[PDB]
Design a protein around this ligand. Structure first.
Ligand SMILES: NC(=O)c1ccc[n+]([C@@H]2O[C@H](COP(=O)([O-])OP(=O)(O)OC[C@H]3O[C@@H](n4cnc5c(N)ncnc54)[C@H](OP(=O)(O)O)[C@@H]3O)[C@@H](O)[C@H]2O)c1
Ligand SMILES: O=C(O)c1ccccc1-c1c2cc(I)c(=O)c(I)c-2oc2c(I)c(O)c(I)cc12
Length: 205
């Protein structure tokens, strides 16, 4: 079974809860962070912290070495400008995985990659274009890749009771950050989503 994981984007909205959940669940977690002050003191703590940047191949290589799987929760912290950070980071992650024999990656893009592609809000198009580039990098890597394509990420509690579809239709257009993290982790213990795109959603009310 997967025991050692790297998380990229662990200091982000979804990353922080995914990290806490992963440690509480018993994983040995390594994170790559640019700024360690963004990791919390309270609660569960990663086993290993690498300070560096996903755009630096050597920093990524150090983070991926020795792992059993990789979770990718990279994002732009609501900077909507044109960007290649996520796709360039994914290229570095794939190269490091291949260099170190790691074969499982679970990565978050967005439900816009399942929904009608002509209905992306204009303000989100640049980020979506880079999600599409990152998805291409991961799909073409040949590695076992679960594409997680969530709708709006909310603040609702952890439930573990959300629905996962393969087509972007579902009970709602929201997933709590906690449930999204829970789903990322679920993907580490099953093969059933490898090579698929997945849409987690739930009605919280
Ligand atoms: N907002 C939504 O409703 C929504 C819906 C669907 C999909 N998404 C997508 O879901 C993904 C996760 O979103 P989120 O809101 O959880 O993420 P987020 O809060 O934007 O966090 C982004 C994370 O990526 C890290 N990161 C950015 N650039 C980096 C670099 N050069 N090197 C290393 N780490 C870097 C950030 O580090 P720092 O802490 O150092 O900044 C942070 O940990 C994103 O791709 C987002 O576009 C969002
Ligand atoms: O996350 C928010 O609330 C938010 C707050 C300020 C500015 C934008 C957003 C936002 C998104 C930001 C990024 I970067 C991203 O990548 C994606 I995809 C976003 O998808 C969003 C979606 I779907 C929504 O339905 C709504 I309402 C807002 C967003």
């Amino acid at each position: 079974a997967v025991k050692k994981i790297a998380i990229f984007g662990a200091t982000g909205q979804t990353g922080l809860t995914t990290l806490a959940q992963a440690v509480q669940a018993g994983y040995e977690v390594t994170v790559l962070v640019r700024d360690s002050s963004r990791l919390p003191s309270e609660g569960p703590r990663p086993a290993h912290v690498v300070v560096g940047d996903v755009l630096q191949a050597a920093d990524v290589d150090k983070t991926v070495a020795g792992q059993d799987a990789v979770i990718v929760l990279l994002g732009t912290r609501n900077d909507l400008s044109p960007t290649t950070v996520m796709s360039e980071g994914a290229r570095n992650i794939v190269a490091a995985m291949k260099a170190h024999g790691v074969d499982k990656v679970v990565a978050c893009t967005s439900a816009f990659l399942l929904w009608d592609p002509t209905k992306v809000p204009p303000r989100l198009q640049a980020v979506t274009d880079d999600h599409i580039r990152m998805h291409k990098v991961l799909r073409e890597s040949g590695l076992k890749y679960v594409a997680v394509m969530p709708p709006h990420i909310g603040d609702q509690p952890l439930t573990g009771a959300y629905t996962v579809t393969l087509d972007g239709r579902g009970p709602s257009r929201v997933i709590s950050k906690h449930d999204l993290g829970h789903f990322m982790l679920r993907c580490l213990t099953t093969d059933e989503y490898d090579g698929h795109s997945t849409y987690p959603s739930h009605q919280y009310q």
